[PDB]
Ligand binder design. Structure first.
Ligand SMILES: Cc1cc(Nc2nccn3c(-c4cn[nH]c4)cnc23)sn1
Length: 263
């Protein structure tokens, strides 16, 4: 279980990050292709995220699902921290969306069930991702969804407001205004994503932070003409200010529009 930088051959930079980037890497002894999250120790302390990184490692290493990016192990040196994660061959859902502008009802529903199934596993172990966004969703060889970047992930109903600033597009009312958040946070993020996948943009996307804050707090979104009644229904049920009004993940999986359009 003991790793070092010299045991790997570094390749193409897969994606850009905040505290460090993701690179393609091969383990010399096995020829195993994987992803390396190189995070600089200096930037971690100068923001106070060292504990959240340990929470990320603690969570992701014990989680085992075909729609959750596996964390094989970790190591560090006199400068950086390294996360040995699985490599998603088909890239991010973010690029997939940028390329296609918007997705069809089939693709949206398939991604929704896949995400829900992975969240159903997460919530059965009482683990909340909180940062469910296309930037954190990846794609395997089969084109299957894969949840990554468990940085803001927490256990039990917590008050540890971590995302704070940055884009709030996917954070529910509870998270944006302190109030203790639970599993329902991901159910909100699910609707944000279902909307975004069909429309090409998030339901509350504004020009400023304070602008988006209003739209999230008042839950003010408007569907375009090309949005189906079935799609509109699922999104309306998911995007409710009150958490107890949002449905259980099984109801999402059961939903007519989901079953009629999924795979
Ligand atoms: C063709 C292609 C494949 C890509 N693969 C990946 N891109 C970005 C991030 N990736 C991770 C990852 C995310 N969080 N922790 C690790 C794993 N595989 C990737 S990109 N273009």
């Amino acid at each position: 279980r003991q790793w070092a930088l010299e045991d790997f051959e570094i390749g193409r930079p897969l994606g850009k990050g905040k505290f460090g980037n993701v690179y393609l890497a091969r383990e010399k002894q096995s020829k195993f292709i994987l992803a390396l999250k190189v995070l600089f120790k200096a930037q971690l302390e100068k923001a106070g995220v060292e504990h959240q990184l340990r929470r990320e490692v603690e969570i992701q290493s014990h989680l085992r699902h075909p729609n959750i990016l596996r964390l094989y192990g970790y190591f560090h040196d006199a400068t950086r921290v390294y996360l040995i994660l699985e490599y998603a061959p088909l890239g991010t859902v973010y690029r997939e969306l940028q390329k296609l502008s918007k997705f069809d009802e089939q693709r949206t529903a398939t991604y929704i069930t896949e995400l829900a199934n992975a969240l159903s596993y997460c919530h059965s172990k009482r683990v909340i991702h909180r940062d469910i966004k296309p930037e954190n969703l990846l794609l395997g060889s089969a084109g299957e969804l894969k949840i990554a970047d468990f940085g803001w992930s927490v256990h039990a109903p917590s008050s540890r407001r971590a995302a704070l600033c940055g884009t709030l597009d996917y954070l529910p009312p509870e998270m944006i205004e302190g109030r203790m958040h639970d599993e329902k946070v991901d159910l909100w993020s699910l609707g944000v994503l279902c909307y975004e996948f069909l429309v090409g943009k998030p339901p509350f996307e504004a020009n400023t932070y304070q602008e988006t804050y209003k739209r999230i707090s008042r839950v003010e979104f408007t569907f375009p003409d090309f949005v189906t009644e079935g799609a509109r229904d699922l999104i309306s049920r998911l995007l409710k200010h009150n958490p107890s009004q949002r449905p259980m993940l099984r109801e999402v999986l059961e939903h007519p529009w989901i079953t009629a359009n999924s795979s």
